[PDB]
């Protein structure tokens, strides 16, 4: 055998899904994972939307392309160049992490949240906490299992608020990932 790298599909109608599976079957060279993981190198969107799988792809520096790249890859009979079809306009961070991952010295880990405090992610947050903690780690940030260690809290938090802590929304994390820019914390405050 099975090709190691994996090709994931998001916002992808079923009629389009079968086409992809079948271009992978004829052209070989990939394995299809249901979710972006360690092996994923390419992510294909049917409709450019910010799904869990597009966020994660941006964190890993994967190619994030339009369904077009498959159509033409089929018409030609080989995996063509990815660059012409990656969704720069919708996710301006993708092209940055993509290039950054391919010129990486050692293995690739984002540096985005590296100069940030330790964050605690609440379990009752949406998206799910497991994937949203993963996002923060993949991007450079460090997460804590208990709030007392964290200087930043993320998501629904009922407990006594803390003056030495900034309590923010999830979209602060997500928007910083999409813009490849640590957004201003003062306009992502969760109250």
């Amino acid at each position: 055998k099975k090709p190691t790298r994996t090709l994931v599909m998001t916002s992808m109608p079923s009629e389009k899904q079968n086409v992809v599976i079948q271009v992978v079957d004829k052209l070989k060279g990939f394995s299809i994972a249901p979710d972006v993981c360690e092996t994923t190198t390419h992510v294909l969107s049917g409709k450019p939307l910010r799904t869990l799988n597009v966020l994660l792809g941006i964190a890993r520096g994967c190619w994030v392309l339009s369904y077009d790249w498959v159509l033409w890859s089929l018409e030609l009979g080989h995996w063509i160049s990815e660059e012409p079809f990656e969704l720069s306009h919708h996710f301006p961070a993708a092209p940055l992490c993509r290039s950054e991952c391919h010129l990486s010295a050692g293995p690739y880990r984002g540096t985005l949240f590296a100069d940030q405090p330790v964050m605690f992610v609440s379990p009752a947050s949406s998206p799910p906490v497991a994937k949203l903690c993963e996002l923060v780690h993949l991007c450079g940030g460090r997460v804590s299992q208990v709030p007392r260690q964290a200087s930043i809290v993320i998501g629904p938090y009922s407990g006594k608020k803390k003056a030495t802590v900034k309590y923010l929304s999830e979209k602060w994390v997500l928007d910083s990932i999409t813009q490849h820019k640590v957004c201003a914390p003062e306009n992502y405050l969760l109250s």
Binding site: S11, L49, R50, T51, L52, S126, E170, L174
Partner: peptide, 4 residues
């Protein structure tokens, strides 16, 4: 797949 939920958007975010």
């Amino acid at each position: 797949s939920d958007e975010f």
